[PDB]
Amino acid sequence: GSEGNVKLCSLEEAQRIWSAEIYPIMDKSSRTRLALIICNEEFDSIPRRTGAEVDITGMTMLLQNLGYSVDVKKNLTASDMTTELEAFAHRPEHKTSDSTFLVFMSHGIREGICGKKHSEQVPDILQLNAIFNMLNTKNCPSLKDKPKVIIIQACRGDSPGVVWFK
Amino acid sequence: IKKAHIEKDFIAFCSSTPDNVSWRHPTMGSVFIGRLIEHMQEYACSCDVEEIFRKVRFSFEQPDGRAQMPTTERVTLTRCFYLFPGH
Numbered sequence: 001g002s003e004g005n006v007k008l009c010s011l012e013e014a015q016r017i018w019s020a021e022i023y024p025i026m027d028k029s030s031r032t033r034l035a036l037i038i039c040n041e042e043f044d045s046i047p048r049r050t051g052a053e054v055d056i057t058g059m060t061m062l063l064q065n066l067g068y069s070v071d072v073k074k075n076l077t078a079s080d081m082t083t084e085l086e087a088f089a090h091r092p093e094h095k096t097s098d099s100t101f102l103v104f105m106s107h108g109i110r111e112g113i114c115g116k117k118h119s120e121q122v123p124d125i126l127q128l129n130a131i132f133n134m135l136n137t138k139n140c141p142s143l144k145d146k147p148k149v150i151i152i153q154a155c156r157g158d159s160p161g162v163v164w165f166k
Numbered sequence: 167i168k169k170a171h172i173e174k175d176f177i178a179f180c181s182s183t184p185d186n187v188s189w190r191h192p193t194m195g196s197v198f199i200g201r202l203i204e205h206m207q208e209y210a211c212s213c214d215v216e217e218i219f220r221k222v223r224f225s226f227e228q229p230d231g232r233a234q235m236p237t238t239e240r241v242t243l244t245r246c247f248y249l250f251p252g253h
């Protein structure tokens with residue numbers, strides 16, 4: 001996939017970006033930055049997401065280059081995903097961290113993310129509202145006042161996203 | 167006891183708009199994922215993540231064949247999140 005190599009901030013460029021309107025960064029040598037990648041490729045009732053390994057490669061390479069230790073979880077149900085997010089939220093490493101990234105890749109509907117067992121008959125959905133709740137100040141006090149970046153690669157229904165004009 | 171906001175400092179960034187499809191090349195990967203990586207590599211140094219997500223949406227502005235519009239959702243970022251790559 002992608003190398004995920006980033007243009008680095010110089011010492012001068014970093015010092016130029018100085019203010020009380022920026023999130024603080026912790027010490028490089030001691031901070032314990034974490035990122036989670038949940039990628040559903042193989043599914044029970046819906047088609048296989050061929051090419052999802054190129055996405056995992058690129059995101060993992062980029063997140064590491066940005067200073068995050070990356071955890072990759074594959075082919076999970078909405079319940080498995082909820083338990084995984086609960087565990088991630090309570091990791092002691094967030095206390096000595098300044099931020100987090102959560103990357104979700106799967107099929108989806110308007111309501112939310114598809115689990116491996118999703119079908120029109122029996123739904124397996126992880127709602128976005130649930131992700132925010134599991135990572136909020138109450139459920140994740142270690143990430144209080146720290147930016148929480150969520151990335152969702154998923155359909156949000158089956159419409160083409162267009163209107164036709166003459 | 168002291169109160170704290172129950173929900174603060176979040177940003178979610180989805181590959182398309184509510185009800186709509188996202189696209190994925192079967193051997194080359196997702197379009198939104200490829201673009202987000204590229205804009206992050208190029209701009210993590212000089213732009214805050216909220217500015218990068220805007221730049222990603224800009225690259226999708228022209229509907230060319232496989233149209234999709236990434237959208238930023240439920241934003242409670244109170245400050246600028248600069249990644250400071252290399253520090």
Ligand SMILES: *[C@H](O)[C@H](CC(=O)O)NC(=O)[C@H]1N(C(=O)[C@@H](NC(=O)c2ccc3ccccc3c2)C(C)C)[C@H]2CC[C@]1(O)CC2
Nearest residue numbers: 049106107108153154155158187188189190191192196232
């Ligand atoms: C929705 O969850 C999903 C995106 C994902 O898996 O994260 N969307 C689809 O699977 C949609 N489809 C496709 O993506 C098909 N891809 C292409 O036809 C395609 C994509 C990108 C590209 C770039 C350059 C040149 C050619 C192409 C072609 C599919 C073959 C994987 C189709 C099936 C379901 C969709 O929602 C709509 C059509």
